[PDB]
């Protein structure tokens, strides 16, 4: 739980990137990872919508009740993603963005508007807002702060195009509204609405905001909203809280890996520590978010001014604040005092941890400094450390020369990690930070202690004439120094000497040899004055105390300790490099010792095996009494992930560093433990009784069913309710029509209007192919670029060729050079649509030729309204129009169109019954813009009555 062991064993965790780590505590599936990652553009919007959403139209999804129901989210949770909405059209900015759906009753369309506001000028002296009332007409709300005594005010879209001008001089605290119109050309670019007020002498004061207005198709909008929502449910954070994180971290409204990483770091910080979301964010290295959202006070005011000294923290960034300890400054210093719960002195130490460079206690008051001091204090706070402990521990890890200052985000994160790992470790071990500090750090403060004077005298008289040949130096040396040290045996001391020599602790690299030389040469006992080098020798002194602690602190088998000191190489050391003193290393020695003791008596065999290459896994297995394969797969597992010492199968068993890593694989795994007088009706009726083609046979209605039939019985009367859905598709059974239609779909959108050709033939002469081009001529229409016309064609021939279309009437030929294999268009210059009415001769210069006949003009436009449903029961036919009946109407798309009829009421009796059964005719039909019927598919719904 909480993934504590994953935190405990950094080696195992090290294999994986934090990004994956997120998967455990906060819910984000690999695919969800993908859903977050995909980029959303307006072009992409439709497909990604098909991607992210099913058949549902965005008009259906946009309804607020529908979302709540679908997501199973509370109204508040829903309100967090989407700007709040009133009963009225009025909507307001929430989290510095406006999100407004706008539907026009005329069109029957759903369009979602999103506006971005960013202040270029002022932000004081100005407040401007923009609301979309409808297409092309917007309401502008602007209020004035600051004073300007102007003759008139001009609201300008750009330097040129003033939206509004006022003869009166604007006054204080009055938001004034003026209706303004913005064009589609205007909307496309994020424009700057600038309010300039001119007073005779000023002459003017200027304040302006940059608005980004985005039009969203129903589909894409839901997608982007989707990411906002999925984030909030899974991470379990507020959409505003996330908003701060995203807005803070990267470009507006984009969810990135870094952003996820930040959500994760915070969650981890808050899971492990009492810390609330806002404080954990700063731990994550963030700046205090000054914004106020959700009717909550900003992170900053809540952080600093929940209590009141008697002043609201301005956080201006202008004010110089006296942080030194030893001075009484502004109330601002007092502000800091209540917030952190610190004295002036300790605050000074805080500032110093924040910035070593800052000579006097003065602060810029910007966000960076506030974040830096707070970082120092929280750095102390999350772990169980006072500022003293945080200071020693920072110097001990070795970091604190280094200041928070401007520090790499990468480095702040590293610092966070180191602190987290060690703190959890000390916490487990029952060791204080100071105890750790005395042992870790290379400090060794220079002083002639009585203890030191005594060691030296004994050793000095002891070592004075030493002959290397006669005896081992360490051996001879061991009892002298041990004698000085309290309760250390000769062996313990000898092990210590080895470690000291390997470590070389000091600003001056030190060796016992260096040490002895200095002693003989320079040192005199009982003399106060001495060579400055002494600081370095003092280094030796504290260092020995240090090394000794490692042995006692870790609790290592003494022989094993000698082994580590004598051959750190086995422990994965550089073997040429000094035995490591790090946090990573100290834990390593400790885990190694515990392991040795666990081995117990057998440990001699193991450690001995350890001296040579003889120790292996599965040998290790017998000792641990774990299954051999467990160790072996630990090894495989080690080999696959990347580690500080790399791990290879040859090596998995022979070198110790791999062994320690493999064992951690073990720790992780073990942790996971791994009569009739109603209608005696048929119980349904949906079979294609008949299917009919469009009038022209160009388009048709593909099979889609009338889901069920219901009925209510009355005296002589019958009420039957039906739910038939309509489908319109443009594809032929097969042939040229499909090709032409494919061209229309590929090259153009729905309602567009254009000419297609009925009869295509191969030319006698000029043709080897018996193959023909499939032409269609597009017009300027709903979606047309510059051109009046474009000639579209589909060519079967694989080989590259030029296609030319010649017109006898026109006497001009549209040309395409090296047309694409599948489909291509020859643009028309000095385009006249009338020309294309005339007979066209199309050919490849190479073997293909075709002659086109029977030109037809077609209008693809179908209002959902024009399409109908017809019914035959009894004497009278019944009809139902789409506008009333179609709940949501489909966006014009060439690909397909679906129409939904809510429910329809139908006649019965009459419908005369034959063979005691009768059917109710239901036929779906449609009519396009040019005036042909797209097709129709007729259905039957049978009914049975009494029996004669």
TrEMBL record:
<feature type="domain" description="TcdA1 receptor binding">
    <location>
        <begin position="859"/>
        <end position="944"/>
    </location>
</feature>
<protein>
    <submittedName>
        <fullName>TcdA1</fullName>
    </submittedName>
</protein>
<feature type="domain" description="TcdA1 receptor binding">
    <location>
        <begin position="104"/>
        <end position="209"/>
    </location>
</feature>
């Amino acid at each position: 739980p909480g993934l504590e062991q994953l935190n405990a064993s950094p080696a195992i965790a090290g294999l994986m990137h934090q990004a994956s780590l997120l998967g455990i505590n906060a819910s984000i599936s690999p695919e969800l990872f993908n859903i977050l990652t995909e980029e959303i553009t307006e072009g992409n919007a439709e497909e990604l919508y098909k991607k992210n959403f099913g058949n549902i139209e965005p008009a259906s999804l946009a309804m607020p009740e529908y979302l709540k129901r679908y997501y199973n989210l509370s109204d508040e949770e829903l309100s967090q993603f989407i700007g709040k909405a009133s009963n009225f059209g009025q909507q307001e900015y929430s989290n510095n963005q406006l999100i407004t759906p706008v539907v026009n009753s005329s069109d029957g369309t759903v369009k979602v508007y999103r506006i971005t506001r960013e202040y270029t000028t002022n932000a004081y002296q100005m407040d401007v807002e923009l609301f979309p009332f409808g297409g092309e007409n917007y309401r502008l709300d602007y209020k004035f702060k600051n004073f300007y005594n102007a003759s008139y005010l001009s609201i300008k879209l750009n330097d040129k195009r003033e939206l509004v001008r006022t003869e009166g001089a604007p006054q204080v605290n009055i938001e004034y509204s003026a209706n303004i119109t913005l064009n589609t050309a205007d909307i496309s670019q994020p424009f700057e609405i600038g309010l300039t007020r001119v007073l005779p002498s000023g002459s003017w004061a200027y304040a302006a905001a940059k608005f980004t207005v985005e039009e969203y198709n129903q589909y894409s909008f839901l997608l982007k909203l989707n990411k906002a929502i999925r984030l909030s449910r899974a991470t379990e954070l507020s959409p505003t809280i996330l908003e701060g994180i995203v807005r803070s971290v990267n470009l507006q409204l984009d969810i990135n890996t870094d952003v996820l990483g930040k959500v994760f770091l915070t969650k981890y910080y808050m899971q492990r520590y009492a810390i609330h979301a806002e404080t954990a964010l700063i731990l994550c290295n963030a700046p205090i978010s000054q914004r106020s959202y959700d009717n909550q006070p900003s992170q900053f005011d809540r952080l600093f001014n929940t209590p009141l000294l008697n002043g609201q923290y301005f956080s201006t960034g202008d004010e110089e604040i006296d942080l030194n300890s030893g001075s009484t400054g502004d109330w601002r210093k007092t502000i800091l005092k209540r917030a952190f719960n610190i004295d002036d002195v300790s605050l000074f130490r805080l500032l110093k941890i924040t910035d070593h460079d800052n000579k006097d206690g003065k602060i810029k008051n910007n966000l960076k400094n506030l974040s830096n001091l707070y970082i120092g204090k929280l750095l102390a706070d999350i772990h169980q450390l006072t500022i003293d402990e945080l200071d020693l521990l920072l110097i001990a890890v070795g970091e604190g020369k280094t200041n928070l200052s401007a520090i790499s985000d990468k480095q702040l994160a590293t610092l966070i990690r180191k602190l987290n790992t060690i703190t959890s470790w000390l916490h487990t071990q029952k060791w204080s930070v100071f105890q750790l500090f005395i042992m870790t750090s290379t400090s060794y403060n220079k002083t002639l202690t009585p203890e030191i004077k005594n060691l030296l005298d004994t050793v000095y008289h002891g070592l004075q004439g030493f002959d290397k040949d006669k005896a081992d130096l360490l051996h001879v040396m061991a009892p002298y120094i041990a004698a000085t040290l309290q309760l250390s045996s000769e062996n313990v001391a000898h092990s210590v000497l080895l470690w000291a020599d390997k470590l070389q602790p000091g600003d001056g690299a030190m060796t016992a040899e260096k040490f002895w030389d200095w002693l003989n040469t320079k040192y005199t006992p009982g003399s106060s004055e001495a060579v400055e080098t002494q600081e370095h020798i003092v280094q030796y002194c504290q260092a020995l105390a240090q090394l000794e602690m490692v042995y006692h602190s870790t609790g290592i088998n003494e022989n094993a300790f000698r082994l580590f000191v004598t051959k750190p190489e086995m422990f994965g050391a550089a073997t040429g490099a000094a035995p490591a003193h790090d946090a990573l290393s100290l834990i390593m020695l400790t885990r190694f010792a515990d392991w040795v003791n666990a081995l117990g008596e057998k440990a001699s065999s193991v450690l001995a095996a350890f001296e040579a290459n003889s120790l292996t896994a599965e040998q290790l297995a017998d000792a641990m009494n774990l299954d051999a394969n467990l160790l072996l797969q630990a090894s495989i597992q080690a080999q696959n992930h990347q580690h500080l010492p790399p791990v290879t199968p040859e090596n998995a068993f022979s070198c110790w560093t791999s062994i320690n890593t493999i064992l951690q694989w073990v720790n992780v795994a073990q942790q996971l433990n791994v009569y009739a007088e109603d209608y005696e009706i048929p119980s349904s009726v949906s079979s294609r009784k008949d299917y009919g083609w469009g009038d022209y046979y160009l388009s048709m209605v593909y099979n889609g069913d009338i889901p069920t039939i219901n009925y209510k019985a009355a005296s002589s009367d019958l009420k039957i309710y039906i739910s038939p859905k309509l489908r319109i598709i443009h594809n032929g059974y097969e042939g040229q029509k499909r090709n032409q239609c494919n061209l229309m779909n590929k090259y153009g959108k729905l309602g567009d209007k254009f000419i297609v050709y009925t009869s295509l033939g191969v030319n006698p002469n000029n043709s080897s192919n018996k193959l023909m081009f499939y032409p269609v001529y597009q017009y300027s229409g709903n979606t047309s670029g510059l051109n009046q016309g474009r000639l579209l064609f589909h060519r079967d021939t694989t080989y590259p060729s030029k296609v030319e279309a010649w017109i006898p009437g026109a006497k001009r030929s549209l040309t395409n050079q090296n047309a694409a294999i599948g489909d291509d268009y020859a643009t028309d210059s000095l385009n006249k649509p009338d020309d294309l009415k005339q007979y066209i001769f199309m050919t490849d210069s190479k073997g293909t030729a075709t002659d086109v006949s029977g030109p037809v003009e077609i209008n693809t436009a179908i209002s959902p309204a024009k399409v109908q449903i017809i019914v035959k029961a009894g004497g009278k036919e019944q009809t139902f129009t789409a506008d009333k009946d179609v709940s949501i109407q489909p966006s014009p798309s060439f690909d397909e169109m679906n129409y939904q009829f809510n429910a329809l009421e139908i006649d019965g009796s009459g419908l005369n019954f034959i063979n005691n059964s009768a059917s109710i005719d239901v036929t779906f039909t449609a009519f396009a813009e040019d005036g042909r019927k797209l097709g129709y598919e007729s259905f039957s719904i049978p009914v049975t009555l009494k029996v004669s």
